Amino acid sequence: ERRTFGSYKIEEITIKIPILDDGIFDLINYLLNGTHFDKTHYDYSHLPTLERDFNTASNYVSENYSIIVEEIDLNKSESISLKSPDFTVVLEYFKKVRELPLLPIMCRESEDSISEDILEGEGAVIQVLKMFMKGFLVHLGENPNSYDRQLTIEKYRPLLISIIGYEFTVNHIYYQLATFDNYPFDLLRFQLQSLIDIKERIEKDGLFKVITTTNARGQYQSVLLRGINGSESYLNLKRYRKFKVRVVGNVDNVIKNDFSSLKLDV
Amino acid sequence: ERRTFGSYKIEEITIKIPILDDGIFDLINYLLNGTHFDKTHYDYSHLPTLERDFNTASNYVSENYSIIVEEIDLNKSESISLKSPDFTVVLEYFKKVRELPLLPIMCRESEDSISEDILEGEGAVIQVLKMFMKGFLVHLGENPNSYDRQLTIEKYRPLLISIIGYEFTVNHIYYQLATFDNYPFDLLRFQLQSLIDIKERIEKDGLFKVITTTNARGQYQSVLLRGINGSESYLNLKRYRKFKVRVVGNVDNVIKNDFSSLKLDV
Amino acid sequence: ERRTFGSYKIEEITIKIPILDDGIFDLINYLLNGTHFDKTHYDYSHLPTLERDFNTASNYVSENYSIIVEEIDLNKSESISLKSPDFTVVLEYFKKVRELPLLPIMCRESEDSISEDILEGEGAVIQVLKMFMKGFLVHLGENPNSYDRQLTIEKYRPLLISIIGYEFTVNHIYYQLATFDNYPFDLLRFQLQSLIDIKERIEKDGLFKVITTTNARGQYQSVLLRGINGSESYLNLKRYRKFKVRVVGNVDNVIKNDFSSLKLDV
Amino acid sequence: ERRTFGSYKIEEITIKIPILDDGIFDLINYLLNGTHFDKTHYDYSHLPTLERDFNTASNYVSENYSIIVEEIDLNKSESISLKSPDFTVVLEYFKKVRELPLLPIMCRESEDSISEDILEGEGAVIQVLKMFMKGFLVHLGENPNSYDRQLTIEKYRPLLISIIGYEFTVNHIYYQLATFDNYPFDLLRFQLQSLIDIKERIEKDGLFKVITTTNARGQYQSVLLRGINGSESYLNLKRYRKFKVRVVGNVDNVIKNDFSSLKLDV
């Protein structure tokens, strides 16, 4: 059941709406386990240095996951969630509920205080995801679909966001990609080229804004990104699921029998 | 939207049951209109003399259809049905209901009284359908499916029946094919070869039996076929429908754009 | 209650979804009556020769509308609809239901048989709409909104289509604009520039495809456009309404009174 | 998200009723925290000595609030309420309920017994609110609305009441303003001028009346104000809420792109 890396799939439901398979839920679980590409469900010539970054980031995320795996109850569904711009994972577990800020880029006054091996671990993670998106887009271009006009990149926004955060804590393409979660596929297929213009001044003074609402029972902090149009968008939760894969098995038919051979009447 | 002749298609529905597209409902309508293969929704090298028989039978069925088209009301859905062994078509029409015995082979005491042109018309029809089935089976062998074990030939039984009727009013393959409407696909894919054995005696004395039930309000006549096992099966009605084809259009994508060309960061 | 020509407006509803006001329903009614710009609900320096084309097309559409106005019953809501690519209007009328193919460009084997005054009338209509869209887009750029990322050009597709039809029966911009009814606003605000590439070959052989489905009770004809990606889209109905304008009246306040004048205590 | 001080806002709801935003709920919370104007959600030239009184009163209210903050449970919505004429705040708190008489002016036989710093604190509070109302009214005059005829000052009555209490425990404008909670906006916009006449005799003998009803389970005390018409009104509870502010963010669009530049056909 192997597949190319960074893939997506399209499935139909009707009462003919399609839905997309991301390559993330499984990707998240793989990074949870530190699993290596060989023992994965996964033609990568144009993917330079893919494996070393892959497995280094897999291990780094593996121990980070273990950091909270240690506390987990035996007894204590799966509805993993992600938050921009510190790109934090969110879990739940019942008897029959935690988080981790994978890439905190909002404020880091430990540029040299944090050890360089940890920094390289995060850099490996962010580059891995960067190339993962590059693969996902190559995949989009490689095969077009009837349903290319029905959905948007919207899931992947925060990852691109994390990219630009590193950019400030070290671009035009990834930024403007992030700017439109609602952006459609074949559009990008058309105008990957001229995505060049804000020019310098709206990002020299912070890429994002931070606002807290004093809800009188707490302090709902929130991050408010600004996009190259010079505009803004609130960051929002996005609960995940993952489709229960079909039992279907490959036909792999070998008989390929001839029919003219049989002495049919005429 | 062209396709190969004699095709079938497989469609999924779930609350993952598949259903088959026959190539008959459309085929019936085409024979209704006498339409020629060029102006059809339809790689036929192994189909000898296909076109001349095709269009001759199309015309013959066209006038036969007109025989009852003349009487039809303007105002007076579509639920066409077929009956073995005279292979009769059945129509309905409402304001917002007839039949025709296309190939009556039960009793014909007009072997020379019926003109030879009419006889050639029916022979063209029966051969056309014969090759149509041969194509359908070549199609089955050409592409196998996950769902090859889920359905049977059951729709096409009466046509094979009509074949054997001509055989008596002029075989092993088509007979035994007809014998099992419940017969599965890939089985035939396996054992097309040895389908040879009843030997002479159960068919010298009539291929079928005829029984009428005196239901006290009418005489329900019925034909009871016997199969090479030396067994029997009652012939049954089979109401038809036809799926409302999807609006889907061919992507026919031409851009096939490169991606390494864009100056992505790394 | 005057407004600039070719305008749009944005209105909120919630149980904060916005909806757009087109400038079409009213525009359609104005062309129905042949009304001139002076006696309209409507800063047009950059609109060359606007009035002469405006009123000529208004008159032409007025008589064309009268062509079916003559037959209308006294007694016999309003749910006007439009169809590409002949860009036909659709009406209904009850006691307490027609159409007209305004710009038939699918097939016209009367290039010189049709008088030149009629041809100039249609050309005036199509240019009028062309500039109307140019104004609509200037309007989009002039004022951006919070909700610029929530809707698409989708209403106006067929008009752009009619444009390209004239192009064949005499471009890159209007074509690619039409190609994406789902296209978002501020995107166009960004990349109006580089919209240049199919190159010659997919449009030399017909801009559109025509397919009829033999639904066994009729012949549902349909037109299937192809877009610069080399892809396709089915053309679809779009029922219209028009919001019942609010009773609101301009405050136009004139008092602008001072307050420090009153002998407030401190 | 800064705004001018003492503001109000107008919001629409329909099944087009408007509602007003006060500048009080937030103001109450700010005085709860002793917050200073700089770190507030808030062009004040005509506001003399605003900041010193602002922050002094903020601190005074802050400790007064702390007086009951000390007792509050950790675990133990928000429905703050105010009562004239001692202008007392009212709170509630649940697991998942107190008051404070901010400006008791009904009876104070401690004119010199109460220290002068406390007295200056209350005087700062009352002047702060006095100017706050003056700003609110300047705001009303500065921008008029369609809905100026749909609501009344009714929320702010008790504050004006507290004013007149100080007047006795040290006017025509603030008194008559208080006299009509049901008074409409643009009226005041018209006749701020001649609000002069009861003349001396109905207020020399107490501004208000006090009546207790022996409800046989308690003593429901109540204060009964008298207005310059020589009439009366019972003082009433007014439960508060505060709208959950919209997530909306400022567009702050910067592109302001030209359109004639693109080589549109005509």
Residue numbers in the entry:
A (entry chain B), B (entry chain C), C (entry chain A), D (entry chain L): 5 to 19, 44 to 70, 74 to 107, 111 to 130, 155 to 228, 238 to 264, 269 to 337
Sentences from the paper on this structure:
The P9-1 protein from MRCV (hereafter, P9-1) localizes in viroplasms of plant and insect hosts and, when expressed alone, self-interacts giving rise to cytoplasmic viroplasm-like structures (VLS). In addition, P9-1 binds single-stranded nucleic acids in a sequence-independent manner and has ATPase activity. Using an integrative structural approach, the C-arm was found to be dispensable for P9-1 dimer assembly but essential for the formation of pentamers and hexamers of dimers (decamers and dodecamers), which favored RNA binding.
The careful analysis of the recorded data clearly exposed doughnut-shaped (torus topology) pentamers of homodimers (10-mer D5 symmetry) and hexamers of homodimers (12-mer D6 symmetry), representing 80 to 85% and 15 to 20% of the particle populations, respectively. The global resolutions for each species were 4.7 Å (decamer) and 6.8 Å (dodecamer) based on the “gold standard” criterion (Fourier shell correlation [FSC] = 0.143), with local resolutions ranging from 2.5 to 4.5 Å (decamer) and from 5.5 to 9.5 Å (dodecamer). The doughnut-shaped P9-1 structures reveal dimensions of 12.5 nm × 12.5 nm × 8.5 nm and 14.0 nm × 14.0 nm × 8.5 nm in the decameric and dodecameric assemblies, respectively. The full-length dimers are settled in a parallel mode related by the respective 5-fold and 6-fold rotational symmetry axes holding their C-arm protrusions as staplers, as previously reported for the octameric arrangement of the RBSDV P9-1 crystal structure. In this way, the C-arm of subunit A interacts with the neighboring (−1) dimer, while the C-arm of subunit B interacts with the other-side (+1) dimer. According to the PISA server, 17 residues (~70% of the C-arm total extension) are part of the intermolecular contacts with the adjoining dimer, mostly stabilized by hydrophobic forces. Interestingly, as a result of the loop orientations, the pore is more occluded in the decamer than in the dodecamer (middle and right).
